[PDB]
Amino acid sequence: SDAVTIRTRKVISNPLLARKQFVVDVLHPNRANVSKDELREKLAEVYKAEKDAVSVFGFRTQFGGGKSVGFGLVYNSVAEAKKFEPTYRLVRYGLAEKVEKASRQQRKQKKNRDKKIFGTGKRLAKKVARRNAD
Amino acid sequence: ARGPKKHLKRLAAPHHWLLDKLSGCYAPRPSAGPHKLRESLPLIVFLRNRLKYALNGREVKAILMQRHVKVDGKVRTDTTYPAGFMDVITLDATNENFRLVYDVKGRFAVHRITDEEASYKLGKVKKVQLGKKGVPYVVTHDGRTIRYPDPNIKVNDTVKIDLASGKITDFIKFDAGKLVYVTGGRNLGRIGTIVHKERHDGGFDLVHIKDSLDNTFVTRLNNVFVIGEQGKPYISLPKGKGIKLSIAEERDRRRAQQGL
Amino acid sequence: MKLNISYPVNGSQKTFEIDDEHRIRVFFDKRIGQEVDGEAVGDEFKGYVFKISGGNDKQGFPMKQGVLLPTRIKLLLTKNVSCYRPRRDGERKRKSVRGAIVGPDLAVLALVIVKKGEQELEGLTDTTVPKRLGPKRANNIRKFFGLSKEDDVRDFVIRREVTKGEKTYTKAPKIQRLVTPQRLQRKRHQRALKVRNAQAQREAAAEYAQLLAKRLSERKAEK
RNA sequence: GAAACUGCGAAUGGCUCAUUAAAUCAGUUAUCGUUUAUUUGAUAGUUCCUUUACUACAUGGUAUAACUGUGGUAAUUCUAGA
RNA sequence: AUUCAUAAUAACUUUUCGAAUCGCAUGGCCUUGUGCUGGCGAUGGUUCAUUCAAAUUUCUGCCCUAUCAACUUUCGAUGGUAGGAUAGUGGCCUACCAUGGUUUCAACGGGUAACGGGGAAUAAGGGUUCGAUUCCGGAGAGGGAGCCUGAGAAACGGCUACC
């Protein structure tokens, strides 16, 4: 609210990935450590992508407040924003969701016992059902 | 011991890669070499060391699989493919056609070419002899062996090749008065163009080498590599121009070329 | 001793109980598959030529024919024996089995039938068994119906049917060895390769002979 | 596509210093004294001796897995006959 | 620097080798029919080079002790020849023949709280003492020994035997 002046340095287009690479300059007096998701709105007004079509990470503020530096990456489309982008950040900005995985005990405890069986696991399951308990 | 070691780690690397140590890890191991030794260049170092487009290793993995980046007309659709000497690199749309040459200090370049001249290599022929079914065979820098050459090129020349068929087009000789672009040693690649050579027979052989700076220095024969006659040059010559001008004046000219 | 009765004609199997503690003394001192007359057993069985096909015991040891010892023995078994199904790629290995002469060490005897009998076709040919997997090969069709081959296979493709998803899945083994191009279109290009390929370097020694005839005439004009 | 055969990996990594005084190891040579899985580059029209009952190449044979249904031992990545 | 690479002879081979495989597009031409062409991948195989390698391999350099002066040779020591065996030269093993090889410029034996090196700590010059360990290379997977698979294991998150 004090001439936040979101500026860029080192703008490079990478058209084989169809993207613009840049940094996020900000001078923000008496408003410190600005945001993440608010800035993806204002960064649209150089390419008019969307409200949510720009990837960005960084924003380490510098000693004293007032300024920060991030590293942002804007593509053309959301349909391009599923293809060459940080998937954890695709989880982050509301694009993707939680993806469930076994905690690494019960992945390696899932597949070890399944390694020491041989069939698909109903031949012997009939035999235990036939004998003990017989 | 027991089999080929496929893991090397950084701080064992061929330092002309210029990889730091705070990431400092298992290095990108090259694939099996197409051309020559581990003085080569993998792909996934080059895309995020000096060309500076790749960010994540999965993202540069998400480039070469879609037949995007092309080398020698081919694509070489696996990841850590090595790079020879004066290798052409055909790019995609926006047409940033590249070429590797080495600087005055052994490091590479940030070099870009046009599609003109981007259809031939220069290969260090080293083993030309005749094989079975009577054919004389020739070898190249990349080992792209080519059938039925022009007989009597010589040994240890360079040839202008096709890179769509085998078909060397124009050879060149190697005598007193050429232009030489050496690679290998502390002082690789200024130019020397000749001043003398000798016999030295059996141990090595030496080539006396002198640029326009007019100091002369001596280099063993396996490193020298001509790219033309006096005032020839075949290729798009880089911007450091191959001089290795000395330690003080480069600081003195950067004291001047920044325009204070 | 237990009566696992099986049947090599189309199929039947179930394991039965025992009494004949003295007629199992017909069974022994031959390994497997030779002969047991049904009349040598009690005459609940007749018209049955019992050949015997192994079994188990206390300790669960199976039977392998490299015996001639009426107890267990531990042995080096590598490839084609009953065990090692495979494992870590050699892996010789060592386990223990019994083979020959049958005693009351045993628990089960796998009796299997040569001759069909008259009386008890309720555990041999009660019902014809629905063997599950048919022919997968197109070669496994034309003499499977004896077609005297010209009858143009894909005639009798088994579609197996359950319309629980309303569309009944209509599936069938997808035979290999189906003789159409692109078997032949691939076959033709390999027939077309060394037409177009081998002549191309044959028309490279030809040009080699041309411009080097004059080149080896030039220094033959050395004077 | 659950398995399961078939193919490559499991010989690299990670750990430790016990043995080991021309031994390893550092530099330095050599392979005209040798073998190579792959990466790359090129490279086989002739295979028929019935070389004229080749007999099918407009395309052959068996030998089997998961699976079905039958088992033992108390157990083990234990295995059998059909 | 070659008996090299190569070519041809005169023959041999439990014959090694040269497709009985899959995905997209669906073509061209009329001799309209499995007439005939008919693209690109994904594999895989004979040789020859490149890399990854792996094996040996010559030159110099290895702390302390003569209260260790001779050490080796039928249980190979040192050579030659001939054969085997290796992936490959050679005492690497065998048959025969010869009597050698190292050594007060410190052999041999013994000690090492001795894995070697790049490297540390100390700091006028010259040093002294470390370096098991962020890298390179060697060895080992309780102790020895032998092993089938595999291009590559004397593998040990492979196996057999003895303690």
Swiss-Prot record, chain A:
Record PTM N-acetylserine, positions in chain: S1
Function: Component of the ribosome, a large ribonucleoprotein complex responsible for the synthesis of proteins in the cell. The small ribosomal subunit (SSU) binds messenger RNAs (mRNAs) and translates the encoded message by selecting cognate aminoacyl-transfer RNA (tRNA) molecules. The large subunit (LSU) contains the ribosomal catalytic site termed the peptidyl transferase center (PTC), which catalyzes the formation of peptide bonds, thereby polymerizing the amino acids delivered by tRNAs into a polypeptide chain.
Maturation and modification: N-terminally acetylated by acetyltransferase NatA. Also partially acetylated by NatC.
Cross-link (Glycyl lysine isopeptide (Lys-Gly) (interchain with G-Cter in ubiquitin)): K20
Subcellular location: Cytoplasm
Transmembrane segments: none
GO biological process: cytoplasmic translation; maturation of SSU-rRNA from tricistronic rRNA transcript (SSU-rRNA, 5.8S rRNA, LSU-rRNA)
Keyword set, alphabetical order: Acetylation, Cytoplasm, Isopeptide bond, Phosphoprotein, Ribonucleoprotein, Ribosomal protein, Ubl conjugation
Region (Disordered): 101-134
SUPFAM superfamilies xrefs: Ribosomal proteins S24e, L23 and L15e
Annotated Gene Ontology cellular component terms: cytosol; cytosolic small ribosomal subunit; mitochondrion
Compositionally biased region (Basic residues): 104-114, 123-134
Protein name: Small ribosomal subunit protein eS24A
Pfam families in the cross-refs: Ribosomal_S24e
Gene3D superfamilies in alphabetical order: 3.30.70.3370
Known partners and oligomeric status: Component of the small ribosomal subunit (SSU). Mature yeast ribosomes consist of a small (40S) and a large (60S) subunit. The 40S small subunit contains 1 molecule of ribosomal RNA (18S rRNA) and 33 different proteins (encoded by 57 genes). The large 60S subunit contains 3 rRNA molecules (25S, 5.8S and 5S rRNA) and 46 different proteins (encoded by 81 genes).
GO MF annotation list: structural constituent of ribosome
Curated annotation (Swiss-Prot), chain B:
Residue(s) of cross-link: Glycyl lysine isopeptide (Lys-Gly) (interchain with G-Cter in ubiquitin): K61, K133, K160, K167, K173, K178, K210, K232
Residues bearing the modification Phosphoserine: S31, S246
Chief subcellular location: cytoplasm
Phosphothreonine carried by residues: T114
Domain S4 RNA-binding stretches: 41-104
SUPFAM superfamilies: Alpha-L RNA-binding motif
Annotated InterPro entries: KOW, Rib_uL2_dom2, Ribosomal_eS4, Ribosomal_eS4_C, Ribosomal_eS4_central_region, Ribosomal_eS4_central_sf, Ribosomal_eS4_KOW, Ribosomal_eS4_N
Places the protein is found: Cytoplasm
Known partners and oligomeric status: Component of the small ribosomal subunit (SSU). Mature yeast ribosomes consist of a small (40S) and a large (60S) subunit. The 40S small subunit contains 1 molecule of ribosomal RNA (18S rRNA) and 33 different proteins (encoded by 57 genes). The large 60S subunit contains 3 rRNA molecules (25S, 5.8S and 5S rRNA) and 46 different proteins (encoded by 81 genes).
The name this protein goes by in its record: Small ribosomal subunit protein eS4A
Source species of the chain: Saccharomyces cerevisiae (strain ATCC 204508 / S288c)
Curated annotation (Swiss-Prot), chain C:
Annotated Gene3D superfamilies: 1.20.5.2650
Keyword check for Zinc: no
Record key words, sorted: Cytoplasm, Isopeptide bond, Nucleus, Phosphoprotein, Ribonucleoprotein, Ribosomal protein, Ribosome biogenesis, rRNA processing, Ubl conjugation
GO CC term (a single one): 90S preribosome
Modified residues (Phosphothreonine): T163
Cellular location(s): Cytoplasm; Nucleus, Nucleolus
Crosslinked positions (Glycyl lysine isopeptide (Lys-Gly) (interchain with G-Cter in ubiquitin)): K116, K131, K149, K214
Xref: PROSITE patterns: RIBOSOMAL_S6E
Example GO biological process: maturation of SSU-rRNA from tricistronic rRNA transcript (SSU-rRNA, 5.8S rRNA, LSU-rRNA)
GO molecular function, one term: structural constituent of ribosome
Family recorded in the similarity comment: Belongs to the eukaryotic ribosomal protein eS6 family.
Other noteworthy facts: Present with 66000 molecules/cell in log phase SD medium. There are 2 genes for eS6 in yeast.
PANTHER family: 40S RIBOSOMAL PROTEIN S6 (PTHR11502)
Role description: Component of the ribosome, a large ribonucleoprotein complex responsible for the synthesis of proteins in the cell. The small ribosomal subunit (SSU) binds messenger RNAs (mRNAs) and translates the encoded message by selecting cognate aminoacyl-transfer RNA (tRNA) molecules. The large subunit (LSU) contains the ribosomal catalytic site termed the peptidyl transferase center (PTC), which catalyzes the formation of peptide bonds, thereby polymerizing the amino acids delivered by tRNAs into a polypeptide chain.
Oligomer and partners: Component of the small ribosomal subunit (SSU). Mature yeast ribosomes consist of a small (40S) and a large (60S) subunit. The 40S small subunit contains 1 molecule of ribosomal RNA (18S rRNA) and 33 different proteins (encoded by 57 genes). The large 60S subunit contains 3 rRNA molecules (25S, 5.8S and 5S rRNA) and 46 different proteins (encoded by 81 genes). Interacts with snoRNA U3. uS11 interacts with MPP10. Component of the ribosomal small subunit (SSU) processome composed of at least 40 protein subunits and snoRNA U3.
Protein name: Small ribosomal subunit protein eS6A
Gene (UniProt): RPS6A
